[PDB]
Symmetry: C3
Subunit: 114 residues, 3 copies
């Protein structure tokens, strides 16, 4: 899976080890080995949420499987939780888009996962 | 809804008030309350369009509903017009990707919109 | 088509001419005239892949048509090869997400392609 966080929080406010923590927690939450987890954190962004430039985040989680109604509620609780604790972003200023990819539409290592 | 603009126009050429103007215009166009609209503008990017690095933009608009053939034409007229007037990007050097998201695939405030 | 490369390789490691080379190679690979191809390269990113911060890339290719099982395998070989040769990223540290877009969901020049 792939997890992307775009935020207007400054780079200095992102803890060291945040990328490793995300990797570990996503591995547990999705049941995927950590070897397959990619995480991308984009701070210092020009963003507004509801008209306001208070801290906010726009996120995406792409996976082959492990996406659905109930799992996505679980992931939202986990990820809003981590962003609130570590980046000090309110969970009502977070959107997370979930994408269930087909394996033929994910390239890796000169081929696809199909 | 969420609206993301990626452009090679420098940060200095992005006018004051632009993120608020986009929030207001998108609220008018989509009917959604401004409180739920998120905007993200990414200047200074390394981009080319048709082989040339003249000003250009790559955009996306995600919404739960209010996406479809006729609506998307209207959004394109609106957004290309704003980009041309405020950032001086020609409309024929803009692509906008539209995504109709299922409510169960959008996380917000520790849950999803399902 | 649109091709986006996010990577933790530094800006100075991106060779001169790379955006044009991507444009040319995607035109040949997809069969689309180069006037339609847009490319966006984002270096210097905070990223991890498999828990490691070694060079990696997260990419996406969006097209109207020309997306599918066998075509995506060919694209992956071409694009992993380019990233390996030009940015010295190992192909097993690259993910490429492929998106087949409907013409009604792509805006351009004040309308859509529908
Ligand atoms: O657009 C909406 O219905 C909404 O209120 C929020 C929203 C947020 C993110 C997204 O990708 C789609 C919709
Ligand atoms: O999670 C997996 O199974 C993967 O094969 C890895 C993967 C899934 C979805 C992506 O967009 C990127 C990588
Ligand atoms: O690929 C084509 O046919 C285009 O006309 C250009 C295009 C296709 C898909 C996109 O998401 C953006 C641009």
């Amino acid at each position: 899976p792939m997890f992307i966080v775009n935020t207007n929080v400054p780079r200095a406010s992102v803890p060291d080890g945040f990328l490793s923590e995300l990797t570990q927690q996503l591995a547990q939450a999705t049941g995927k080995p950590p070897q397959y987890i990619a995480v991308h954190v984009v701070p210092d962004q020009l963003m507004a949420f509801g008209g306001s430039s208070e801290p906010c985040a726009l996120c995406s989680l792409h996976s082959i499987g492990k996406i659905g109604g109930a799992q996505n509620r679980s992931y939202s609780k986990l990820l809003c939780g981590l962003l609130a604790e570590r980046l000090r972003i309110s969970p009502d200023r977070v959107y997370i888009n979930y994408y269930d990819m087909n394996a033929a539409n994910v390239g890796w290592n000169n081929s696809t996962f199909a």
